[PDB]
Paper text:
However, amongst these remodelers, the INO80 chromatin remodeler appears largely sufficient to generate the well positioned +1 and −1 nucleosomes. S.c INO80 is a multi-subunit complex consisting of 15 subunits that are divided into three different modules. The catalytic module with the Ino80 (ATPase) RecA lobes and insert, Arp5, Ies6, Ies2, Rvb1 and Rvb2, constitutes the core unit of INO80 (C-module). INO80 slides nucleosomes with 40 bp of flanking DNA ~100-fold slower than nucleosomes with 80 bp of flanking DNA, displaying a switch like response to flanking DNA length.
To assess whether the nucleotide state affected the location of the Arp8 module, we determined structures of S.c INO80 on 0/80 and 0/40 nucleosomes in the presence of a non-hydrolysable ATP analog (ADP/BeFx). The overall structure of INO80 bound to 0/80 nucleosomes in the presence of ADP/BeFx is similar to the previously published structure in the apo state. The INO80 C-module is well resolved at a resolution of 2.8 Å. The Arp8 module is resolved as a well-defined density on the flanking DNA (~40 bp). Although at a lower resolution (~11.2 Å), we can dock the previously published atomic model of the S.c Arp8 module bound to the HSA region of the ATPase into this density. For X.l nucleosomes, no difference is observed between the previously published structure in the apo state and the structure determined here in the presence of ADP/BeFx, suggesting that the nucleotide state does not influence the Arp8 module’s conformation on X.l nucleosomes. We further find that for the INO80: X.l 0/80 (ADP/BeFx) sample, a majority of the particles have clear or partial density for the Arp8 module on flanking DNA (classes 2a and 2b) and a small proportion do not show density for the Arp8 module (class 3). In contrast, on 0/80 nucleosomes, where the Arp8 module engages the flanking DNA, this location of the Arp8 module potentially represents a sliding-competent state of INO80.
Residue numbers in the entry:
A (entry chain U): 16 to 460
B (entry chain Y): 15 to 209, 220 to 460
C (entry chain T): 21 to 154, 161 to 463
D (entry chain X): 21 to 463
E (entry chain Q): 1211 to 1303
F (entry chain Q): 1025 to 1036, 1069 to 1117
Amino acid sequence: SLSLIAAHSHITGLGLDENLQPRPTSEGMVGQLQARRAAGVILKMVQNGTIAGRAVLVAGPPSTGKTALAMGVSQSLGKDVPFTAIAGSEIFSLELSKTEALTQAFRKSIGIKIKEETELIEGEVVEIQIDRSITGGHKQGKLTIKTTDMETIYELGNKMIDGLTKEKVLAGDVISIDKASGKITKLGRSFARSRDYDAMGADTRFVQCPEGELQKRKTVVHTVSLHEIDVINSRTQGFLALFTGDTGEIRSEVRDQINTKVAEWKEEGKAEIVPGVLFIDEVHMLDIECFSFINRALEDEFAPIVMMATNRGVSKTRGTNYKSPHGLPLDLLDRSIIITTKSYNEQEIKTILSIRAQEEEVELSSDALDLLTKTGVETSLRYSSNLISVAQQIAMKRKNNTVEVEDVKRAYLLFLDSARSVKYVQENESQYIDDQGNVQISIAK
Amino acid sequence: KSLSLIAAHSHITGLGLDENLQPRPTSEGMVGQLQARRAAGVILKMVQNGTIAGRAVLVAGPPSTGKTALAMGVSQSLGKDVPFTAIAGSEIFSLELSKTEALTQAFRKSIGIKIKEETELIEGEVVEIQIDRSITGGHKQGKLTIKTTDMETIYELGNKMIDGLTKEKVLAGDVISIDKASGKITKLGRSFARSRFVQCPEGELQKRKTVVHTVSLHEIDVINSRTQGFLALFTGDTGEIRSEVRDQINTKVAEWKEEGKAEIVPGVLFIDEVHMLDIECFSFINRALEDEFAPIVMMATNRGVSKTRGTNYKSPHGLPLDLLDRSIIITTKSYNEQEIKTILSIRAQEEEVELSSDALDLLTKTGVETSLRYSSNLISVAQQIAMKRKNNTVEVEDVKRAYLLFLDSARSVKYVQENESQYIDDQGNVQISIAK
Amino acid sequence: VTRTAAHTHIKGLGLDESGVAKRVEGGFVGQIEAREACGVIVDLIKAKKMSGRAILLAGGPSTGKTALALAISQELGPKVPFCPLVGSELYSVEVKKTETLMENFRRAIGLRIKETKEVYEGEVTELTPEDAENKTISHVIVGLKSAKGTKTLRLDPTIYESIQREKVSIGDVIYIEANTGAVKRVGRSDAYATEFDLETEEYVPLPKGEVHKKKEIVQDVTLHDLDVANARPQGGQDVISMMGQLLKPKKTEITEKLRQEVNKVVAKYIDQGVAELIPGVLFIDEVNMLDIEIFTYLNKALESNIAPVVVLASNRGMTTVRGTEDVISPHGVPPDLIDRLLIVRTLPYDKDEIRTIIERRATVERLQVESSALDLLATMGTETSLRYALQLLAPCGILAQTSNRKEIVVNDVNEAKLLFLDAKRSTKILETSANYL
Amino acid sequence: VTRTAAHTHIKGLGLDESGVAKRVEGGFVGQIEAREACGVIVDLIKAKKMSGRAILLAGGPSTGKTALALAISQELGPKVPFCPLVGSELYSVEVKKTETLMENFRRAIGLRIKETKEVYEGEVTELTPEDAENPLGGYGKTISHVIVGLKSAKGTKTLRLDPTIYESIQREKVSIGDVIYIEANTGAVKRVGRSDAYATEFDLETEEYVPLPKGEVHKKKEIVQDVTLHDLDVANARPQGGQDVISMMGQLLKPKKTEITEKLRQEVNKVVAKYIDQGVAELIPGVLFIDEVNMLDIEIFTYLNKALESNIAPVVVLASNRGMTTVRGTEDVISPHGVPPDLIDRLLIVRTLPYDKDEIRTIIERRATVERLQVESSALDLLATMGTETSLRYALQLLAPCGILAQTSNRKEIVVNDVNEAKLLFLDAKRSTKILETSANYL
Amino acid sequence: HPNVSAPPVTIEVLGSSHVTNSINNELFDPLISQALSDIPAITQYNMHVKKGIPVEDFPKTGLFPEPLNKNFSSNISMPSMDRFITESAKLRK
Amino acid sequence: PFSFTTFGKTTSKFTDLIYSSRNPIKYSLPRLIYEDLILPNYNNDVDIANKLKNVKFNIFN
Ligand SMILES: Nc1ncnc2c1ncn2[C@@H]1O[C@H](COP(=O)(O)OP(=O)(O)O)[C@@H](O)[C@H]1O
Ligand SMILES: Nc1ncnc2c1ncn2[C@@H]1O[C@H](COP(=O)(O)OP(=O)(O)O)[C@@H](O)[C@H]1O
Ligand SMILES: Nc1ncnc2c1ncn2[C@@H]1O[C@H](COP(=O)(O)OP(=O)(O)O)[C@@H](O)[C@H]1O
Ligand SMILES: Nc1ncnc2c1ncn2[C@@H]1O[C@H](COP(=O)(O)OP(=O)(O)O)[C@@H](O)[C@H]1O
């Protein structure tokens, strides 16, 4: 509901068959048959979950669909599987080192599934009668919990009374108590007992009285990443650092102890390891120290599958003074397999543009689609994809529903691409600030 | 008054200008620089009008020509309760603040909010205090007899008055002041009882007092930031105040001006050595001058076609051309013999240095051949040499002795270049041996 | 008397109902094509459908890129969020620059929440706490009274705790918010002002209006406000603390888990109809000051599902990108980001629209300029720069006012040109002189 | 007997009443014009009138610039605040370098204050609290007042303390029979210790035993205190000394330098000017000495240009061995002594000249007499030739190995063989460099 | 020992008792003041035995850190009689 | 240490001793800032926004 239409919202996964053969147009993915087949092979390895630490480099020219292929892999991966999509610039931080940030990105992409059984008694409290013991030990209580339908009486122990007096629950408060584990919550105050007070308190919350059965059974599946366990065991109250982010370079011995405990919890069967994918978009923006740490960190058994994206040619590696293919050193490319994405022809440009126009609910005419395809082949895919929405707004300002040739031509005239802007800058270089800072603001001499 | 020894700009009491903004040749401690002083008077009238926001001016010229003197004259002619924030260019390179955040704090320290309020005060001379204790101490009663030069009254005190008078112990004969609503008692001091000493105050006790507060926008930003107390106004650990707090402060200040409960006092942000900022600070200044709640920024620099910090190219005044497009430049010129002589005479008159006419001529010749600051520094050491010989007047020989003992820049350069083997050069080579 | 900034005279884009830019309308003159492009952009923003759209305003200095950005801001209205920013502001010494960019991204997505404000104001007449133990009070009966009458309320022990926090006794005018539960003691009434001749009590009048007052308000928050509301290393934002806490809270890298939880809570409140989502504009002036790492994170963050419309400004040409060594790119923006941008070209001006800009700035600043003085100012603007005349307009008015004239004459313009220099004359003085000017 | 350092032999500038310099007095040899200029500067500091006066000591290595700064500090006396500093010390990882420079500027300005202290001192006889009637309200404390009885010599009185003062009492662990000392200015309590009126041989906590304090309880005593402006600034920036919880928790936090604002400094200046106007405090301006001023970069020099123009800035003296050198932090700014010409224009350069053979010889003689060594005349002449040939500092620092080799062979005198053996054992920089140039495996 | 000991900067707002109440509640908060101190022992006997308050419902106390010595507890130093002998070499000898 | 304090000093059955130390540096704040930006008011919204940001939109609710 909150999500708007983004650049990759039309992709619902890799458009493959059961034989890992890509369809020409399926699930929002058009073309790139070799790349989609290779990504389908990658997805199966993640789904097998029996091998660890493979580095996959998605390489190609820009606007060819490396990030589109990564989002297709993430959508085909399904839910409750840890997919961590980060950029290469996020590793450089201020209170975390680059290796520690890479370790946190690695351990956020592999988790454990844990099954929980809850016997929840949810209802409004009618009366709490406390049997006051003479010695004070084993304080018996009588809880009158009540739903819309029906109401029982529960016996309450001393720690139950201490938990129900630690948080302030009174008559008319909606609480649910777990029978197996004794978990305590306070959902708030019932709406039936809401008008008795003229002004509500600071922490007073109003919730509806639950209906149906008083006690309900539910099975809850929790997917907890390894980084979550690291942050929890790093501090006394570590759950705040899961959200505020000031974890602060978790020491190694916590990580080895957590790895050994995850192994023994696996061997006794109360949790199961779910591996996932860590996707580093624009991986060329990383230091050589980051690349060396990636090279050593891919060899652990608790390591996810690493998909890296690069649009660089033979470029200078960051942190050094020599050039390298993909902006990556040769020992990183040694422990990697490369998926190459190619450019699109006119039919693939037209199909992707039609899919993006259908996603944004824009009614493109045939001549407007042909003009946008010609502009996409001439300039770029992303220029025509950005031109579609402003042409839609131009046509809507003209009191028209569908777009025509004139709306696309007006959007082409109003908004420039890279080559036209380069030509306009190079024709009048005195009006812009040079690399030496020189400029001519004066219009006459 | 406050703490003030004799400084470099102590003689400047403002801009020596007429009602038609015409500079007098010698007035208010400032001589020379007629066009620069008239331009500074125009900028002062822009500040005093208060209807023009975010104007950047650049005071540029040779060293020892009076750019900082012009800024001090503008600051002295501005008056009280108008915020003048003078900072150097190196002050915004902080370890706990970003440079744009430090520039934001310097910008918003120069815009004040003027609020007038009324308070009922009871300032009087205590005749006597009686308090009758109870059997146990549950209730305390008392009578406070106070007086002024005109009036004399007795008050039946409550419990909180008794507790606030026993704490901060008031005896008979004390002139005190009481704020009734806040319950604060300030002992102004002992009265004229022979048995500190302050006279008995005038009559009409419980008087309305109008207090006019000028609070800078940075202080309200620190206050409204709920994670920042006002102790960060003194400790300095404000720590990157968020932008949304500043937007709430701007909207509240605009609605206070619309409601008439407060006024806006624009001020001057002076940046000495503005070439020491880098290019990102120049871009931030270029955008931040467009705010409605932005002061008038005076910038001083002496560099000429220098390399801009953060870049690799050279720009005029060390400033990029988009910043110089947003600014009007005031140019200061050098001084002749007569202006140097008048400045040296003013500096001697300030430091209570009595010197002869030929000593003044010798100091003027030194300040023409060498520099104005070298002669102005030589004045005080020549005076010390004069009182070493038990002489109350600085003669020619005292100036000659001070010139012999203390060197200028050119003599130090020549004496270094004649004996360059004895010093450490760029390569770290030195011959500490004196023979062979 | 209102102050005047550099962009005060501009009130909007000056377009008609058909989107065609009127030549002189809305504080603008000329620049019709970029104004129409910005009108298409604000129509796209008002559609409230797209995310991550990016437009770059490219043109020379003093051509109106920031003018068009603030014109977009007035065309959208104060309801739509607008985050103006400099590329230099992203370099923070407390948190990393990509986190600052993502925080400014979340600052441009807002929420409207309709809410009620109900206030009980007046003097406490009765304060009777009913205990009904089961030590612990059951409730408290509080009788408030103003000049229009009295009213009795039943309050829970939390509000009784807040009342006893404020040292509220019988006879004190107090303030109670029914929804929040906040209790503020205004002070003692003047009916009890003569119990003692002198006491520390602050005696305030009885409220002239009713005890109970109810009204409707709207809360305009952002997603960054809700992000920093529940991401505090040291909590306690609810308690009113004039003095600071003992440990200074520092800006931290907010994880994506808090962003997803905040998004889930916001979507749950939107699906109930309580809150309304308003996408807004993040404007970055001088985008050439961004590091290449910030450009890479901008490339990653423009593909988010909740990203706002980003408007970038630059005045450079074929320039090396900051943080690189040999990447010559247009406007200082790398070509991977440029492929995601839509470029709006900003043209220079000629003499006539420079003259109308000068006369519009003179009319807004309430200065009377004679016609030949206006022609001299326009000629100086064509010769030196437009901003030189726009900044010399006010010294001309001051020099006219000191001569007891309300009309700016040609001699005032000559005197202001003599007193204040432009960049070219100061550069000539710099080049001719030898000893550092 | 006494431990000696490089500048132990110097007692002062050694000038006459007319300011002229005797050739060998005050531990100084030579540098007559430099000593006279330093005496003029010392008289300028003793005038206590000017602000921001800055001189530069310029010369080669081992010429006596730090010697002249120490002589200035010795001639001014211990009351005048002298702040020695290195240019490298301003680079701090906790706070910016300009704040460190301003902190040293405020540290070089001193204040002498007469302070009246209200004191309740005496032996605790009874200590009974009065409990609150509702202890668990959450708004007050468990007690309301505390009655404490104190007796001094010829006097006994009782005090009713509020719970804050009793909290300060009980944090000192005060019991019955303890002589204590309550300072009413801050609420601070000093526990002097057990009274000697009882038995003092049955304790296990190595406590001290004190008599009853003389005079009455509740005295008013006058203390002369010497502080600096930086002490007031750092006390107000990090508040400790009150009994409120902010002061007490700020006692326990880790101290860290902060950027003290101009508002706090102006408020401190206002309070100090009020102290002066009541005639209770006097201002003593002092000296900030910066040796190796070449280590400062261009930002510290730029801030120094502004900071020297203040009306409270001290007298700043600088030292540098550099000649025509580039300024640190710049690329092409060649400047004399590594100091930019904007600061040089605000300076007064005091030149320092190298020494001759006989001056080096008597400097070696004075360093031998201050280290309690006996040197023969021929060995002293060989030490003088070695000092003129290699370096003065090498000849001064070879005296202690000569004394070690002399006391090894059971002699008090230093013979020529001892200084020859010390020349053979220890090398100067030139002979070491000659070994470096004629070696293969990078000696 | 430090040279200057200072309380925090007092903020005064004229004509408002709410500011004074909030400042007194902030500087002298009873929970933090009780945490950095201790209840007297006879007072603890009065609440526990005479008033029947359980020990678990007592306010939390004794959280102030211990100093190194009794000498490090306060910054005030008494004039030592044994120091007075050694202050003058004539009197010490 | 030098006490940077202003306190109740005698200028010259029990005598009570009350802690009364204050800083000589006084920061003057207007009533308008405190009553319009910090305290709740009918024309203000600090309590409503505080409850909305701290309770209604808390992710741990
Ligand atoms: N195979 C594809 N199917 C559908 N859309 C695609 C495909 N490849 C690219 N696109 C579209 O092109 C745009 C840019 O592609 P992108 O994933 O950014 O390529 P790269 O990551 O190589 O720059 C995306 O918004 C995406 O919608
Ligand atoms: N026109 C003037 N009138 C009086 N004093 C002046 C004037 N110009 C300069 N001075 C004095 O000369 C000294 C050095 O000038 P300064 O302000 O430092 O110039 P700059 O800042 O350009 O180096 C200052 O102490 C200043 O008071
Ligand atoms: N077309 C225009 N019509 C009216 N005023 C304009 C126009 N273009 C620019 N201005 C004015 O010129 C001034 C400077 O332009 P600005 O937008 O700052 O240039 P830049 O695009 O380099 O930021 C602004 O105050 C603006 O009000
Ligand atoms: N005029 C002098 N008389 C006596 N000793 C001197 C004299 N000048 C220098 N010295 C000695 O020479 C040594 C070097 O002096 P110092 O000032 O530390 O070096 P620099 O001059 O390089 O700063 C010092 O230990 C000092 O005792």
